[PDB]
Amino acid sequence: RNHCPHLDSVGEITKEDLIQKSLGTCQDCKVQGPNLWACLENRCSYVGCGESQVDHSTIHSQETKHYLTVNLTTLRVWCYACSKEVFLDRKLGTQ
Ligand SMILES: [Zn+2]
Ligand SMILES: [Zn+2]
Ligand SMILES: [Zn+2]
């Protein structure tokens, strides 16, 4: 198992949901993109901004223990628990 558990637990969001988050707007405040983050938790669908604005992604991460956040600006995933950037595979193949 050469992968992070935090992210390995969360799923993936559809383009439909990401499209709204990619619009460049925070679900908590009104900072307006670019540079916006979105909860990677397949079960969660919240839009927050990183430390570059109000670190909403961090706060939300603690509140819901969601240490997975992906910036819609570069389409990159980040792991708070691991304390680094991670990548989300498109296809697994377990079941
Ligand atoms: Zn915000
Ligand atoms: Zn969340
Ligand atoms: Zn991790």
Side-chain angles (χ1 to χ4, degrees):
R1 217 124 134 161
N2 265 317
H3 217 178
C4 143
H6 316 107
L7 65 91
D8 188 6
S9 66
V10 296
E12 208 225 46
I13 311 174
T14 55
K15 266 196 185 298
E16 290 106 340
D17 269 50
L18 284 187
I19 218 64
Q20 268 245 21
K21 321 212 242 271
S22 68
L23 285 165
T25 63
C26 194
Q27 230 136 35
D28 228 49
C29 65
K30 295 212 228 141
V31 287
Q32 257 260 273
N35 246 227
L36 256 185
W37 303 65
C39 193
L40 200 85
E41 226 105 341
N42 185 0
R43 256 287 199 79
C44 208
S45 270
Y46 243 91
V47 188
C49 44
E51 231 293 72
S52 312
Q53 301 259 220
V54 190
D55 209 35
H56 263 146
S57 192
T58 301
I59 320 190
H60 171 110
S61 159
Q62 282 73 102
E63 270 154 327
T64 55
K65 282 222 208 87
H66 298 171
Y67 312 116
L68 286 293
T69 178
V70 63
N71 46 66
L72 317 130
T73 333
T74 27
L75 264 167
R76 317 274 206 164
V77 186
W78 179 265
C79 195
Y80 281 118
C82 273
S83 90
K84 49 101 100 218
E85 223 145 287
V86 296
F87 51 89
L88 262 291
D89 219 300
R90 216 145 179 76
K91 261 213 166 103
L92 278 164
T94 307
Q95 209 301 90

